[PDB]
Amino acid sequence: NGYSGYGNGITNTTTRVIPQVEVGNRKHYLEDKLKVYKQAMNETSEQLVPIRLEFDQDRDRFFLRDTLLWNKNDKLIKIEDFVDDMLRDYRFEDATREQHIDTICQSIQEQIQEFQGNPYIELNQDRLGGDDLRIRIKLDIVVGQNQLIDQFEWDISNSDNCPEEFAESMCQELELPGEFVTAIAHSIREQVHMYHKSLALLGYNFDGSARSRMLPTITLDDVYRPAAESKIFTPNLLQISAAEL
Amino acid sequence: ELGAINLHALSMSLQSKNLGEINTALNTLLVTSADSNLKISLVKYPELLDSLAILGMNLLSNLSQNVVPYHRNTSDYYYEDAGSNQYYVTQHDKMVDKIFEKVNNNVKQWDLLPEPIRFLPNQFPLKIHRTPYLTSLKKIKDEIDDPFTKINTRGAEDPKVLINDQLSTISMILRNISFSDNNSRIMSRNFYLKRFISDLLWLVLIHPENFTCNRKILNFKKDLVIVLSNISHLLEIASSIDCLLILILVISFGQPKESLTFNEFQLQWGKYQTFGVDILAKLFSLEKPNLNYFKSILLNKNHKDKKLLRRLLNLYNHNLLNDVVSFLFSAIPLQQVLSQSADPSLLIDQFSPVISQSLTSILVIVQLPFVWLSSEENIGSGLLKLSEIILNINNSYSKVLLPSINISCVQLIKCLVEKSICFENCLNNDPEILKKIASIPNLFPTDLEIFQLFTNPSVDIQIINQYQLLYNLKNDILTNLE
Amino acid sequence: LYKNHELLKLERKKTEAVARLKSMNKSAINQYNRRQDKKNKRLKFGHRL
Amino acid sequence: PQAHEIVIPSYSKWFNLEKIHSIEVQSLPEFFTNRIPSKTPEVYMRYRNFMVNSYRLNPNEYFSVTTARRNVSGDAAALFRLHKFLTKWGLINYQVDSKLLPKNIEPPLTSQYSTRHDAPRGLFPFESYKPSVQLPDM
């Protein structure tokens, strides 16, 4: 009769056996999840990880300039498998040696191996809404054809506030459709981390002021709302331009 | 038959609805039956086995719980809504809702995938179903035509038989899958499959009545022991219970009636009693300090599991493994030594040696309050005449003959000496034992045979040493008797 | 399977000895060098006085 | 607006873009222990419906997890997990390719329904003799 098991399929053939003809191209993976997944992620979850990827430089020929997140608390994925899936998703030449994936996972684990999430600021300290030190976060992004730049207070000492909310809020612009918001939070989680990460190299993750470069890089008390030309850095702009990057 | 191409039916099988389960299970069974050119390869298969074991576990479970699946009044059985959320809510603001809630009026654990296996409350161990192949006639009597056959030879007019035949078919197809490389795919690593085997055993033998046709029970036992035969590697996770289960499974065969409890099987009916000892060798060769050790604890006479174990041993009533000995002592003699030639032997001879191997192996495991001796006008030992047979064959299949005769001799000497020294250590018996030992016609090859042996073949050096030390112990016993 | 398993068993203790003997040899050599050291530091202290 | 013909491997006919089912939780429980507050059935359903809509838009051509990752994220890991999951269940990226056939005909055909022996529910092919009329009927 009819023919359907795998994409409108064929069920009327020379009566053979075919294992999982599902590939868009090398696309079938469900094997070996059930037990491990259940037993593993039935327990608490914790911090995430921003990651940047650059491989187009004149040492290797790529379009690798993408970012993404990650859970260091995870042990469920052969990272290389994820990488290869991403690459095949990038339609690259199947030869993943000239499309060397090893280098990529190297860079990946490299970046992951310098992280602690938020410091004892989360691990043992708990300050209601954090304490202070809202960094003047500066974020510019280049999507589609347009770049967007902004600077604004955003606390490092607080955990109660997650990035993505800022993302969906500033979505209320023209459309800021989709692809934007991610990198923002990524950059956000990027931007903040290093700072306390660098501060982790010292020791103020509990106390107040630090030790020398943290002095210029701060907000102040701000007992009164500001002027128009200073905050005139906070606003945002959408500008077309010929690309030169 | 034909059509019937794809493999990915697993998906539908994985789905939880009666429909898909039927559609696939039946088909794929017919598939694995066909072998003219039809085999189930291994590329990204495993998902199949998982799905299968999961299905069987759940079905057998709620069967033991006596409750039909596939049909309730609940559906899509958790949250359904389109509430106040775009992508990220349930932060601080959620407590405002509480505030909101307090003014408008003017966490969980998750279970694992499968259910538990034992300790199931309803299922509490009571001795039933330790009955031999005899039940076949029971089966006949069951399958016999009668005004009350209650063999709904048709489909499921009630769901009970539905679940029954479901599990039956699953067992069958599982058997058929298990006849090739990809035994490695089944090799003791489909933790799911092993859970399935375990709990299925724990039911079939401790079976409060939910199975319709005893013939179904036979089918289960049968294809189960078969699929076991196609395993030659580890088993026995949460072992002890499983080990005892497997022992009772192999003991299922052979006619019962101290002394040997087993009339040797007249080898023209059965072929499974084979598979039994086949497995009790293969899946028992692993001297890894688990399996052997589990049976060693079975010499004795979460934590509740241990309570279970002894709970069955006294619920099998002294010792018991003597029964295993007697069982092992079947299918070898009394037919080939009673034939008209030694050539038709070679066939079942091929089968024989693993048995003696198993035996002598377990006799490494007997070196404490017992009463054991197993040469008491029960078997004698034609082993000597058999050895002579294979010897005359030698100087007149292959590759198994010499080891068979060798280990036969070793078996003889070891069991002799172990019996002697055991009842020496106990010393609960008169020295008549020696005289008793000295009173066997089936024993101690005559020294004239030794002599003439020492000359003609000259191709049996090790065997010559075997007989040599044998005769040595013989003459020793003779001397020190007085 | 039986033969291979028993052979690996024998070797588990073949390797056992390989170690026991490797580590005794080590201690023996270290002890001898310690003698020589003490003897030298002694002679050296004397010759300085 | 609707502009395509969307089919699915039937056994999947338990999924509903509106609600959730015990199936997926047993396959993706990490959004239901209520342990990680940044995850919830709700955001799950959001992701779910978003991705299935995306695929159903132009299903003739494939859709990647990397795509969604670019679009929206709260995680790469779980995103990939569920994406590949739906892939397996063919709810997504199922009609990536098309296949056709001329389909010659045979004696059985879908428009063939005649009078013949029947396995179904009761039917009586022989009605009544003469003396049956001899009854003081109703």
Q: How far is CA B284 from CA A92, A114, B247, in A?
A: 52, 50, 11
Q: How far is CA B155 from CA B161, B317, D123, in A?
A: 8, 41, 21
What is the DSSP code string of B391-409?
HHHHT---SSHHHHHHHHH
Residue position matching structure tokens 């390869």: B41
Instruction: Take residue A76 and report the two structure tokens written for it.
Output: 């469920």
Chain B interface, best mutation among A10, A11, A29, A30, by max B CB count within 10 A: A30
Which amino acid is it at B424? E
* Facing residue for B8 by CB, picked from A12, A16, A22: A22
Which residues lie below 8 Å from residue A73, measured CB to CB, with a gap of 6+?
A45, A46, A47
Query: How far apart are the C-alpha atoms of B352 and B277, rounded to whole Å?
Result: 10
Query: How far apart are the C-alpha atoms of B331 and B379, rounded to whole Å?
Result: 12
Q: Is B110 on the interface with D (CB under 8 A)?
A: yes
What is the DSSP code string of C18-49?
HHHHHHHHHHHHHHHHHHHHHHHHHHHHHHH-
**Sheet of strand A239-240: strand arrangement:** A134-143, A146-155, A239-240
Which amino acid is it at A72? K
> Residue A18 gets which letter from DSSP?
B
Instruction: Take residue A2 and report the two structure tokens written for it.
Output: 């009819």
Instruction: Take residue B75 and report the two structure tokens written for it.
Output: 């559906």
Task: Name the 3-class secondary structure at B104.
Answer: helix
- Asked if residue A6 lies in contact with residue A21, where contact means CB atoms within 8 angstroms, the answer is yes
Instruction: List the one residue out of B189, B303, B283, B301 whose CA is nearest residue B242.
Output: B283
Instruction: Take residue B229 and report the two structure tokens written for it.
Output: 């035969």
* Facing residue for D70 by CB, picked from A29, A37, A182: A182
* Facing residue for C5 by CB, picked from B232, B287, B357: B287
- Asked if residue D90 lies in contact with residue A4, where contact means CB atoms within 8 angstroms, the answer is no
Which residues lie below 8 Å from residue A139, measured CB to CB, with a gap of 6+?
A149, A150, A151, A184, A187, A188, A191
Task: Name the 3-class secondary structure at B263.
Answer: strand
CA–chain centroid gap for B329, Å, is: 17
Query: How far apart are the C-alpha atoms of A79 and B180, rounded to whole Å?
Result: 34
Q: Is B109 on the interface with D (CB under 8 A)?
A: yes
Instruction: List the one residue out of D22, D15, D77 whose CA is nearest residue D48.
Output: D15
- Asked if residue D92 lies in contact with residue D83, where contact means CB atoms within 8 angstroms, the answer is yes
Chain D interface, best mutation among B22, B75, B110, B192, by max D CB count within 10 A: B110
Query: Helices (DSSP H) in A129-171: which residue ranges?
Result: 163-170
Q: Is B11 on the interface with D (CB under 8 A)?
A: yes
- SS3 readout for chain B: CCCCCECCCHHHHHCCCHHHHHHHHHHHHHHHHCCCCCCCCCCCCCHHHHHHHHHHHHHHHHHHCCCCCCCCCCCCCCCECCCCCCCCCCCCHHHHHHHHHHHHCCCCCCCCCCCCCCCCCCCCCCCCCCCCCCHHHHHHHHHCCCCCCCCCCCCCCCHHHHHHHHHHHHHHHHHHHCCCCCCCCCCCCCHHHHHHHHHHHHHHHCCCCCCCCHHHHHHHHHHHHHHHHCCCCCCCCCHHHHHHHHHHHHHCCCEECCCCCEECCCCCCCCHHHHHHHHHHHCCCCCCCCHHHHHHHCCCCCCHHHHHHHHHHHHHCCCCHHHHHHHHCCCCCCCCCCCCCCCCHHHHHHHCHHHHHHHHHHHCCCCCCCCCCCCCCCCCCCHHHHHHHHHHHHCCCCCCHHHHHHHHHHHHHHHHHHHHHHHHHHCCCCCHHHHHHCCCCCCCCCHHHHHHHCCCCCCCHHHHHHHHHHHHHHHHHHHHHC
The neighbouring-strand residues paired with B85 are none
- Asked if residue D17 lies in contact with residue D52, where contact means CB atoms within 8 angstroms, the answer is yes
Interface chains of chain D (3 or more CB pairs under 8 Å): A, B
* Facing residue for D22 by CB, picked from B20, B78, B109: B78
Instruction: List the one residue out of B237, B388, B383, B233 whose CA is nearest residue B305.
Output: B237
Q: Is B45 left (phi over 0), alpha (psi -120 to 50) or beta?
A: alpha
Experimental determination approach used: cryo-EM
Instruction: List the one residue out of B466, B408, B463, B475 whose CA is nearest residue B438.
Output: B475
Q: Answer whether A31 sits within 8 Å of B91, measured CB to CB.
A: no
Which residues lie below 8 Å from residue A147, measured CB to CB, with a gap of 6+?
A140, A141, A239, A241
Q: Is A130 left (phi over 0), alpha (psi -120 to 50) or beta?
A: left
Other CB atoms within a 10 A radius of the CB of residue C34 amount to 10
Q: Is A4 on the interface with B (CB under 8 A)?
A: no
Task: Name the 3-class secondary structure at A149.
Answer: strand
- Asked if residue D91 lies in contact with residue D11, where contact means CB atoms within 8 angstroms, the answer is no
Q: Is D77 left (phi over 0), alpha (psi -120 to 50) or beta?
A: alpha
Query: How far apart are the C-alpha atoms of B102 and D43, rounded to whole Å?
Result: 26
The neighbouring-strand residues paired with A148 are A141
In this complex, whether C and D touch, counting 3 or more CB pairs under 8 angstroms, is: no
Q: Answer whether D34 sits within 8 Å of B12, measured CB to CB.
A: no
Helix/strand number for chain A, H first, E second: 6, 5
Our CA angle for B351, B354, B355, nearest 5°, is 90
Q: Answer whether C5 sits within 8 Å of B357, measured CB to CB.
A: no
Which residues lie below 8 Å from residue B383, measured CB to CB, with a gap of 6+?
B408, B409, B411, B412, B442
Residues in chain A: 245
Which residues lie below 8 Å from residue B190, measured CB to CB, with a gap of 6+?
B46, B49, B50, B53
Four-residue CA torsion sign, A211, A216, A222, A223: positive
Q: Is D116 on the interface with A (CB under 8 A)?
A: no
Which amino acid is it at B115? E
Residue position matching structure tokens 């299968």: B52
Q: Is D23 on the interface with A (CB under 8 A)?
A: no
Query: How far apart are the C-alpha atoms of B338 and B389, rounded to whole Å?
Result: 12
Query: How far apart are the C-alpha atoms of B298 and B278, rounded to whole Å?
Result: 20
Question: What is the least distance, in Å, from the CA of D81 to any CA of chain B?
Answer: 16
The secondary structure element, H or E, covering residue A49 is strand A49-52
Query: How far apart are the C-alpha atoms of B5 and A6, rounded to whole Å?
Result: 12
Residue position matching structure tokens 């002697």: B420
Residue position matching structure tokens 């590949």: D84
- Asked if residue B270 lies in contact with residue B253, where contact means CB atoms within 8 angstroms, the answer is yes
The neighbouring-strand residues paired with A149 are A140
Task: Name the 3-class secondary structure at A218.
Answer: coil
Query: How far apart are the C-alpha atoms of B268 and D45, rounded to whole Å?
Result: 64
Instruction: List the one residue out of A133, A118, A115 whose CA is nearest residue A207.
Output: A133
